[PDB]
């Protein structure tokens, strides 16, 4: 079996290899990439997402989120406090202000140390889940707004026709902005392109060991666990690499830089943080191998998770037994 230690693999496709998205994902899996839960793809040197980013300051962040932490440095939750709208230009200026800017540091490791030591004592502001794309329409390869849809994948694989659409989201980050431990909706894949700015550090648990993380999470967040059988779906819980190591949870880490893609694989739990002002674009996608994960995916039914319109059909077709109870949580 390929990649038995479940290491994060890094790929360097040629421009020829970069033409067929599905084929390259299948290739990465043939090499065992999915066992890690996360892979990095460095685009060929000839490729560009768009000409320049010189005209993006006018994008609106309608609902910036202030990420307020509770708990201890290595085990905490964060809640999202809504702030007044601001443009990306305003947000960038805020990110670079003395209050929010990345501190002096020696390297990525020093910055990682500072993040886990000090994150809880600050409340950075994130522009997350903004529907849109920064890929040029003329970019034909790995354009996250031009991928085959999850609905079409389900139809091709299962012969079922369903409602729903599947579009990308933009994420504007600053120092300490954080993504909590989670898998994707329906345990889908995700693909994430870092368009511009400072890096993003990722942590990931191999899909074959996801239940180990869940067990630890139930121990570390006991109230949350009692409230919901799938509380990680709430996307609010953080556990540091030190605490993971102390508890023997298998995981890996890697830092994504501007111009690089990351792919998360079905049921690959991931979390991470931004180093400074940046902009990423991400979307969920599916392959034939996903279908069985979609059938088995946990669901939040306590009402906290609250997911997109399009998830309805996924649950309805792949998890009909769960559908009634799950939908009671949406209404
Ligand atoms: O439902 C699960 O398998 C689960 C179990 C323990 C913690 C969290 C979850 C979750 O899905 O978020
Ligand atoms: N609010 C809340 N619930 C659980 N389980 C927590 C653990 C740590 C910090 C806050 C928490
Ligand atoms: O970039 C972020 O803030 C969060 N991204 C993801 O969880 C993802 O691409 O799957
Ligand atoms: Ni994700
Ligand atoms: Zn819930």
Swiss-Prot record:
Coiled coil regions in record: none
EC number, UniProt record: 1.14.11.66
Binding site for 2-oxoglutarate: 126, 192, 200, 235
Residues reported to bind Zn(2+): 228, 234, 300, 302
Transmembrane segments: none
Catalyzed reaction equations: N(6),N(6),N(6)-trimethyl-L-lysyl(9)-[histone H3] + 2 2-oxoglutarate + 2 O2 = N(6)-methyl-L-lysyl(9)-[histone H3] + 2 formaldehyde + 2 succinate + 2 CO2
Claim: Transcription regulation is one of the keywords in the record: yes
Cofactor binding comment, as recorded: Binds 1 Fe(2+) ion per subunit.
Binding site for Fe cation: 182, 184, 270
Domain JmjN: 8-50
Molecular function (Gene Ontology), one example: histone H3K9me2/H3K9me3 demethylase activity
Function according to Swiss-Prot or TrEMBL: Histone demethylase that specifically demethylates 'Lys-9' of histone H3, thereby playing a central role in histone code. Does not demethylate histone H3 'Lys-4', H3 'Lys-27', H3 'Lys-36' nor H4 'Lys-20'. Demethylates both di- and trimethylated H3 'Lys-9' residue, while it has no activity on monomethylated residues. Demethylation of Lys residue generates formaldehyde and succinate.
Family statement: Belongs to the JHDM3 histone demethylase family.
Protein name: Lysine-specific demethylase 4D
Residues of the full protein shown: 11 to 341 of 523
